[PDB]
Amino acid sequence: PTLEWFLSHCHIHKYPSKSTLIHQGEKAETLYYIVKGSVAVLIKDEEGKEMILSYLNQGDFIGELGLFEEGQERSAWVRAKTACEVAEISYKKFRQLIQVNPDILMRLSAQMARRLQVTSEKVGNLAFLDVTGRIAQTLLNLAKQPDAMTHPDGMQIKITRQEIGQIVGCSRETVGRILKMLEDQNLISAHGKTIVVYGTR
Amino acid sequence: PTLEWFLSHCHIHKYPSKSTLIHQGEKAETLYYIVKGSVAVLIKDEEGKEMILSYLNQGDFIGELGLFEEGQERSAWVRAKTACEVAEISYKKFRQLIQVNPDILMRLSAQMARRLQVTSEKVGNLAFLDVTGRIAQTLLNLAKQPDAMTHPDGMQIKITRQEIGQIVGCSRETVGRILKMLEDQNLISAHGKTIVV
DNA sequence: GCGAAAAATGTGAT
């Protein structure tokens, strides 16, 4: 399949858990593709707080927002979540490749298009909702996220309050008090391993 | 170049001051092109409010997200800040134009990455800044803009308080109560006009 | 599948 033409030119490498895959600011060097495992992508403010903006899992393409112009600094931080294998090709060679088969360039644009639907939703969520709203919404998202392991009354996830405050944009104390709130209503069962129960699965 | 070959196949239309060229929610088929004019992409909440998620101008492709996922919704709302001239091609045709001269595709994919980029910044200005912070860089970015006039020494953009309010995500009454404060803290001077120094 | 050490947490007036 078309993928294998790229995945052959693209050098697979092992990256351990927590291993800072890409750093913000550097200069657009390679094009990356996750052949096993997962990744987190985050930015930080005036200086200090990091905020997650997306994860990405098997089959995505990291760092492609340079590719179409020259001299772009890295957009943001990309830090491995679980250990993963991120294969890669040099920008210059990607282009030459695009012409010998452009239906992978097609496949890239797909991700570069959907990621902005998701991201424009985010602006939505941080402008129109309040933290309880964002949290509730996010838990549903994460249930959808491939990470989840089923539990006989809803999708299970083992994430942490610190991280929710980080995706949600709020101090982890408020995560503590709201996750408690949605528990004393039966929307949530929660001990480190959280299960947001919506019935159906 | 690749541009004039591409365009030709596009029914060209002249939408007037504040038309609605894409209603959010509806069906996707048209990949538009502003051959002249300017757009304001919005998102709206079922209850009253909206957020100016982007300005788009001449040269920009529009309604591009449908194209790879067959069967979809029109992500947001495109309105019209001035009389424009927009071109149009059926997606399934555009897809054929891809597979004969693949340069036009790049030009959209590049239109995207720059967007993906500026929007991810928007995300952050919301999770990290004061209203003052926000209004402030909004008065800066609004000067890196095709429609702003190089006033005596600096940029003179016109844009109203409710307008800045929609971009920022803050109330109108705060916006005014605040930007005129960036005047004592001599960063701007205004009067309908916002003569960012 | 350990248990020492490393990380996450939560509670309240302002």
Place this chain on the structure above:
DNA sequence: CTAGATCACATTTTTCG
């Protein structure tokens, strides 16, 4: 314990015929 929202309604600024 601080930032920014929410009240109507005249005064004020802007809109082209």
Place this chain on the structure above:
DNA sequence: GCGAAAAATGTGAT
């Protein structure tokens, strides 16, 4: 090159 209506605004506790 000028006059109505029309958009937009400011404020002030809380």
Place this chain on the structure above:
DNA sequence: CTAGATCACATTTTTCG
């Protein structure tokens, strides 16, 4: 008016050699 951040350390639970 009202929502959440927040300071600081006991205590609880999750990571890793």
